[PDB]
Write a protein that binds this ligand. Structure first.
Ligand SMILES: CC(C)CN(CCc1ccc(Br)cc1)C1CCN(c2nnc(N)[nH]2)CC1
Length: 377
């Protein structure tokens, strides 16, 4: 099994106990650590934060403590846009420029692979031709990584991609059966299914549909997303199930209607550390005073409300349920967004350090046998 965990290079700017740096990383928590995010300049892989080079050394230095650990660098993300990807994949010359830059960059900074996080080929302004061009890019990278391993004698660079759960995005951008052959693993973004952009409450990451749902809405859940990627040609062993250590919040139209599907007027109040209306870290919801926690029985996940605020999130129990699910489906493991959103320092939830991600590791049977300081949940 794999446990693929994302580090984010902006968590270093959060205040107080929420500030996260590579020092807060546990070298033996995950099997693969992915650094979010790199960018692109003139079709070449590039840093995005002023101190990325410092952080890369600390991040990849974790492998000194755990030589088994693999690291990857993720390019893109949700603020990156699409134009730079579109321009880079548009010609063979630009793709070659990118691919060669990626090999040099990853080797220079001691990463073991590249994770593609384009949001998304064929959507969000990206033209329809980017669907096939993304396939070509994936093939170009896979082939070049294979060739570099041959010529250099080094362990082949890994290639993964973070892929959407929603059918509209999948069909607009992803030749699933083709790309799955060339990717080492597929990081399924099984979250952001619902959120404050919608006019009624809904859970960030429900495992199954609600009985009431119909039409396209009935596929906005983890099980449908997993089945979608499997049926479209992803080998189960390559499919890695995303798990969110965050929730999505709503302001309710009325404090008297707190159901799933209740009317909402907009995003929930921003969290005190993450400061982004509509989202909350696990550590911002786990210890909410004077709130009422509920479970969505059909969907196997919790929500919590207080006054006119409503948040759908994941807890230890839902992570256990989702790992049981992924094992039943024979998936390759779990992926987690993100290290810095779990209670990484144990400052909030009274569950020790990394309670959610340790739950994943435990349920995947990935606890190191020589481990001393872990915490079972
Ligand atoms: C703007 C928002 C809808 C993006 N979404 C949630 C990110 C996020 C989570 C928690 C908080 Br607090 C603030 C922002 C991302 C989740 C992670 N995801 C992702 N990218 N790559 C992987 N493997 N997962 C990209 C979207």
């Amino acid at each position: 099994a794999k446990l693929v965990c994302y580090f984010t290079n902006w968590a270093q700017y959060r205040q107080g106990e929420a500030r996260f740096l590579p020092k807060d990383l546990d070298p033996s928590l995950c099997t693969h650590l992915i650094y979010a995010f790199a960018g692109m300049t003139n079709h070449q892989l590039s840093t995005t934060e002023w101190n990325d080079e410092t952080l890369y050394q600390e991040f990849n230095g974790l492998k000194k403590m755990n030589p088994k650990l693999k690291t990857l660098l993720a390019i893109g993300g949700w603020n990156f846009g699409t134009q730079k990807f579109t321009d880079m994949v548009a010609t063979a010359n630009n793709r070659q420029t990118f691919v060669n830059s990626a090999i040099r960059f990853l080797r220079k900074y001691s990463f073991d692979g590249l994770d593609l996080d384009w949001e998304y080929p064929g959507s969000q302004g990206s033209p329809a031709v980017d669907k096939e061009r993304f396939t070509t890019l994936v093939q170009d990278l896979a082939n070049a990584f294979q060739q570099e391993a041959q010529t250099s004698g080094k362990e082949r660079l890994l290639l993964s991609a973070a892929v959407p759960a929603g059918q509209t995005y999948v069909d607009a951008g992803y030749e699933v059966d083709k790309i799955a052959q060339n990717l080492d693993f597929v990081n399924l973004m099984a979250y952001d299914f619902h959120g404050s952009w919608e006019k009624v409450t809904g859970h960030n990451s429900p495992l199954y549909k609600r009985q009431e749902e119909s039409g396209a809405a009935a596929s906005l859940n983890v099980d449908a997303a997993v089945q979608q990627w499997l049926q479209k040609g992803t080998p189960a062993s390559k499919l890695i199930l995303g798990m969110p250590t965050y929730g999505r919040s709503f302001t309710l139209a009325s404090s008297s209607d707190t159901r799933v599907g209740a009317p909402a007027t907009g995003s929930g109040t921003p969290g005190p550390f993450t400061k982004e209306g509509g989202m909350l870290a696990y550590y911002e919801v786990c210890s909410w005073k004077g709130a009422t926690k509920q479970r969505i029985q059909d969907q196997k996940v919790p929500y919590i409300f207080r006054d006119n605020q409503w948040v759908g999130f994941d807890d230890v129990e839902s992570f256990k349920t989702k790992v049981s699910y992924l094992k039943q489906k024979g998936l390759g493991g779990a992926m987690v967004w993100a290290l810095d959103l779990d209670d990484f320092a144990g400052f909030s939830c009274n569950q020790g350090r990394y309670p959610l991600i340790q739950t994943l590791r435990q349920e995947l049977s990935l606890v190191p046998r020589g481990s001393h300081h872990h915490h079972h949940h």
